[PDB]
Design an enzyme around this catalytic site. Structure first.
Site, PDB file in Angstrom:
ATOM      1  N   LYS A 126     -30.838  35.728  35.215  1.00 23.59           N
ATOM      2  CA  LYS A 126     -31.957  35.331  36.064  1.00 23.59           C
ATOM      3  C   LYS A 126     -32.214  33.833  35.981  1.00 23.59           C
ATOM      4  O   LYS A 126     -32.523  33.192  36.991  1.00 23.59           O
ATOM      5  CB  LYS A 126     -33.214  36.109  35.679  1.00 23.59           C
ATOM      6  CG  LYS A 126     -34.422  35.796  36.546  1.00 23.59           C
ATOM      7  CD  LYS A 126     -34.175  36.068  38.014  1.00 23.59           C
ATOM      8  CE  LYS A 126     -35.468  36.464  38.697  1.00 23.59           C
ATOM      9  NZ  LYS A 126     -36.145  37.586  37.993  1.00 23.59           N
ATOM     10  N   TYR A 149     -34.680   8.849  19.561  1.00 23.28           N
ATOM     11  CA  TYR A 149     -35.211   9.488  18.360  1.00 23.28           C
ATOM     12  C   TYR A 149     -35.825   8.511  17.361  1.00 23.28           C
ATOM     13  O   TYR A 149     -36.555   8.925  16.455  1.00 23.28           O
ATOM     14  CB  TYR A 149     -34.120  10.309  17.670  1.00 23.28           C
ATOM     15  CG  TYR A 149     -34.666  11.521  16.951  1.00 23.28           C
ATOM     16  CD1 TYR A 149     -35.254  12.563  17.656  1.00 23.28           C
ATOM     17  CD2 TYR A 149     -34.613  11.613  15.568  1.00 23.28           C
ATOM     18  CE1 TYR A 149     -35.761  13.670  17.003  1.00 23.28           C
ATOM     19  CE2 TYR A 149     -35.118  12.715  14.906  1.00 23.28           C
ATOM     20  CZ  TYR A 149     -35.691  13.740  15.627  1.00 23.28           C
ATOM     21  OH  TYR A 149     -36.194  14.838  14.967  1.00 23.28           O
TER      22      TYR A 149
END
Ligand SMILES: NC(=O)c1ccc[n+]([C@@H]2O[C@H](COP(=O)([O-])OP(=O)(O)OC[C@H]3O[C@@H](n4cnc5c(N)ncnc54)[C@H](OP(=O)(O)O)[C@@H]3O)[C@@H](O)[C@H]2O)c1
Ligand SMILES: [Mg+2]
Lengths: 758, 151, 152
Positions: free
Chosen positions: A93, A38
């Site tokens: 899913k 970061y």
């Protein structure tokens, strides 16, 4: 339906919400790593991406990441519940994407339900994803929306089922025409219920070299043919036959050859199938209720080629068949889209597989594969170790053939090697065990029949039909505990109860126990007291007599308190002078088994060799190729302690007994688990890849390693401790064993009792 | 074992982490009477004598040490709270095998190791497979230890 | 029979441990004249009102000696020697006489674990008496120590 309604309502979200956990696959445990991620240090990958967009799939996700992007308008089989409200089955899913092929799924759900702004939002979110998995876009805006979306992004825009099962469906067609020695040129078809995944399927089915005039499309409103309605229906008039007065479906057969249809309730009848030509090829794909009731039609007519989409019968069409593996071909090739050659070469792989399925470490025992190409086998079963390494390379090969990819794969030997390596680390050997146990339940004693965990496991085993439980305990306490727990099992109806006191067979039981143990320190009165206060002795005597086939004990007390009884009653197996307990772990390298975590405190070379051979045989029976590594603190002769010398002696003995077994040692744990370290140390090692069986010098090392790894580095419970070397099927468990562990171990004992329980 | 436990607790304290020691064995709080478990219990008593303020318990299993629910089920009155961050093992084989398996299976990154304790002067013997990051971290640790009377 | 004799001679206040039903039917079959409560107290190994306080004490004694809470619960229902030892240790009884069933050390281990050793004493021994032609003779440690050393 609470046994399914409540059980499925009990969803695995309790530890941390959401099946997906966006987590750093890279270490983030040091300020250096945090600054690399970061702080200045992460600006470099982004700048390199910006300089040339070729680095998008490389430094980030969007390489393996699809996003099942949805407006929640047809959620699998639910419908238009909403984007955010679709999150349960959305994640359902998305979880059979990573589970079976390692596909990252960002379950971002578009809130824009309009058929023209939905595309705008999806194209807005295009740079986040390297291939969209458009699902839950409902009909008829599924076809409209997908048609709009295909033409905008320069990354694989591959819808769900609309593009979808056509690959599996047309593969099934290609194999079925092979079965009845017919040809695509003269085949006739009947389609019913032109829904979301139905009306788009014959379009691929035509691409095989099929004339359009042979397809008869139908819907709820009779038959969609040219002449029926004054306004000809789009995408259906090309196939539409001339008007002939055929207004009922029961006559439009006229000896057809295919019933490709993805719709709801039944439309086909038995006389309809009779009107079909020779060798009918009904392909009723309805999930709720099959459109033909295959048993009834098969009794009406033989040599049926009935194909469904449910896993209860062979030739199942799931998404896992090719969807994760399509993107494993789509995303892993660098395509900018998915053409019809993508959709057709993957037809030539799964269809090839059904008549070219063999070997692949068949479970030596257990499993009961029994799969041969024919009228009852058209396409492979839902889950297969090469359903990936055949379908994904087919899609990639079609990508290079279409010349639409951006990262063409190099020599396919390396690709197949990496794909197979990924295959080794994801195995589901417990499903064949459950399937084989269910088709032949046996009687299993549960001596701790008053335990809440054992009662829950009994409920599960009764529901799944895996075993015929025989609980041991006070019937009163068992019944009150059942009522308090909320279970739906009853004595005699579902499970037999053996009362530890006032047993009608008490006299014949303690007599046999005494005759076994009279010269082993047990008097007649001690035998009488044991057959009333020791449920393990009662269960062991039951199994030995023949009134039960297997035992599952150990949920109370110490392991050796039960193992001593088991060994005293049953004894050792023929040709075997030792016993060992094998514990299974799901490591990042795959299923790993640790040998003798419970029985022998300090085994010697001969005992270690016997344990190694038994563990290899058991792992072979699971369907996994045994790769043994004897572990020590010394790396290939580094130390000369008696432990390492014992490990080397065991290695030599094992090599003598089983020359075909892949084994090496003694080495370190990291050398065993990662191949690079071993190749650096021993380039000529007989062990290839990661070792799945770890044999430890002593029980302390084995137990400590297993206990630490189970709570630190482990996904789920499969089996353990698997007791090997005892005459009859029995598994001593631990007091902290969960209900899932008990159910799995009972199923394993049932399957082992199907194989001469002696 | 008691000396190693005390030195490990002192070193972990110097890192800024509160030491939570757990002596590991294949026996869970007296389950087995092997000489190894008796040795672990003797070490626990010796450590409690030497350092009454140190949070330590044993001997227990690895899962009992690492997850608090298992320990509370087994020993509700355990002196160890939360997860143990120092695991003292009965022998070098168990320690090495567990560390090697966990490092390649269940581990994020390299910080330090093997930190040598009990020698007069600052020195750390590494392994032939130590990475550059490991060497840099261990050199930094040795430098900081030499800032604290390198003897 | 020994309970009948002790009630008759007034030597002890027996506290029998067992199923009251089986005890009573065995008494009737044997022909004894003892009754529950009237002559001897019965402690039922199951459904004992003091079950919670008994297995708790057994666990606190044996928690770090290989006994879990569930094992303590199972012992205070299936091991009468543990029940009697906990009874004596608590103070609800003054003495115990076990060993008529099972092995000697199965009971002696429970006895030693609960009560412990005497003050200033680090060993135990069992003395057996014989009436020889030379008089009363006692043989020392016939049951406890297999191979005692000089101090033992
Ligand atoms: N891989 C699989 O196993 C799989 C995948 C997807 C779907 N499916 C199955 O397919 C069905 C729906 O899936 P989908 O979302 O693709 O389609 P859908 O959008 O739900 O449409 C289903 C179509 O069936 C027709 N229909 C409804 N009732 C009918 C009746 N009584 N007679 C004739 N036609 C009727 C309707 O056509 P009209 O609009 O003209 O009424 C409707 O458009 C369900 O049965 C589902 O389980 C299975
Ligand atoms: Mg769906």
């Amino acid at each position: 339906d609470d046994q399914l309604k409540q059980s499925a309502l009990d969803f695995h979200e309790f530890p941390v919400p959401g099946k997906i956990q966006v987590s750093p696959t890279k270490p983030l445990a040091t300020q250096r790593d945090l600054a690399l991620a970061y702080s200045p240090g992460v600006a470099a990958p982004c700048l390199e991406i910006e300089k040339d967009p070729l680095k998008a799939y490389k430094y980030t996700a969007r390489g393996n990441l699809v996003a099942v992007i949805s407006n929640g308008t047809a959620v699998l089989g639910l419908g238009n519940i909403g984007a955010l409200a679709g999150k349960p089955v959305m994640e359902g899913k998305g979880v059979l994407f990573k589970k079976f092929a390692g596909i990252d799924v960002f379950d971002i759900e578009v809130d824009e339900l309009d058929p023209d702004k939905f595309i705008e939002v999806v194209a807005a979110l295009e740079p986040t994803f390297g291939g969209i998995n458009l699902e839950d876009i409902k009909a008829p805006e599924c076809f409209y929306i997908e048609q709009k979306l295909r033409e905008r992004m320069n990354i694989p825009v591959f819808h769900d089922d609309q593009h979808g099962t056509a690959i599996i469906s047309t593969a099934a067609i290609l194999n079925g025409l092979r079965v009845v020695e017919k040809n695509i040129s003269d085949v006739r078809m009947v389609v019913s219920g032109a829904g979301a995944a139905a009306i788009a399927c014959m379009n691929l089915l035509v691409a095989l070299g099929l004339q359009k005039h042979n397809i008869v499309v139908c819907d709820s409103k009779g038959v969609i043919y040219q002449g029926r309605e004054p306004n000809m229906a789009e995408t259906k008039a090309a196939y539409a036959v001339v008007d002939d007065g055929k207004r009922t479906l029961d006559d439009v057969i006229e000896g057809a050859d295919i019933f490709l249809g993805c719709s709801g309730p039944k439309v086909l009848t038995q006389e309809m199938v009779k009107k079909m030509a020779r060798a009918p090829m009904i392909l009723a794909l309805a999930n709720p209720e099959p459109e033909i009731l295959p048993p009834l039609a098969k009794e009406v007519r033989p040599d049926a080629i009935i194909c469904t989409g449910r896993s209860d019968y062979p030739n199942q069409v799931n998404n896992v068949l090719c969807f994760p593996f399509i993107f494993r071909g789509a995303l892993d090739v660098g395509a900018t889209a998915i053409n019809e050659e993508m959709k057709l070469a993957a037809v030539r792989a799964i269809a090839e597989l059904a008549h070219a399925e063999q070997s692949e470490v068949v479970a030596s025992a257990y499993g009961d594969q029994d799969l041969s190409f024919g009228p009852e086998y058209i396409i492979p079963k839902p889950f297969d170790p090469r359903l990936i390494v055949k379908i994904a390379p087919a899609v990639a090969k079609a990508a290079m053939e279409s010349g639409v990819a951006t990262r063409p794969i190099a020599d396919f030997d390396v690709y197949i090697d990496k794909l197979t390596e990924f295959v080794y680390k994801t195995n589901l050997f417990m499903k064949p065990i459950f399937s084989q146990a269910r088709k032949a339940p046996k009687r299993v004693v549960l001596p701790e029949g008053e335990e809440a965990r054992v009662l829950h496991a009994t409920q599960e085993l009764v529901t799944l039909g895996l075993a015929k439980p025989i609980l041991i305990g006070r019937p009163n306490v068992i019944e009150m505990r059942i009522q308090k727990l909320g279970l739906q099992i009853k004595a005699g109806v579902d499970f037999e109860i053996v009362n530890n006191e006032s047993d009608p067979r008490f006299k014949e039981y303690w007599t046999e126990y005494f005759q076994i143990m009279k010269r082993r320190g047990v008097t007649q009165e001690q035998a009488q007291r044991a057959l009333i206060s020791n449920p393990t002795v009662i269960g062991a005597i039951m199994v030995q007599r023949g009134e039960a086939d297997a035992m599952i004990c150990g949920t109370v007390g110490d392991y050796h308190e039960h193992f001593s009884v088991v060994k005293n009653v049953f004894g050792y197996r023929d040709g075997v002078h030792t016993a060992g307990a094998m514990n299974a772990l799901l490591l990042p390298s795959g299923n790993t088994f640790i040998a003798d975590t419970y029985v022998n405190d300090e085994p010697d070379a001969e005992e270690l060799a016997e344990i190694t051979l038994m563990a290899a045989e058991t792992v072979r029976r699971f369907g996994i190729e045994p790769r043994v590594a004897l572990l020590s603190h010394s790396n290939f002769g580094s130390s000369d302690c008696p432990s390492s010398s014992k490990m080397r002696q065991a290695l030599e003995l094992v090599r003598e007994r089983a020359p075909e077994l892949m084994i090496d040692g003694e080495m370190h744990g990291d050398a065993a688990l990662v191949e690079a370290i071993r190749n650096d140390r021993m380039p000529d090692s007989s062990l290839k890849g990661s070792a799945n069986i770890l044999v430890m010098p002593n029980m302390e090392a084995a137990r400590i390693s297993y206990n630490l790894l189970r709570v630190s580095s482990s996904e789920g419970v499969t089996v353990g401790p698997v007791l090997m070397g005892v005459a009859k099927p029995v598994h001593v468990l631990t007091p902290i064993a969960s209900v899932r562990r008990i159910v799995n171990m009972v199923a394993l004992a049932v399957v082992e009792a199907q194989t001469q329980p002696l």
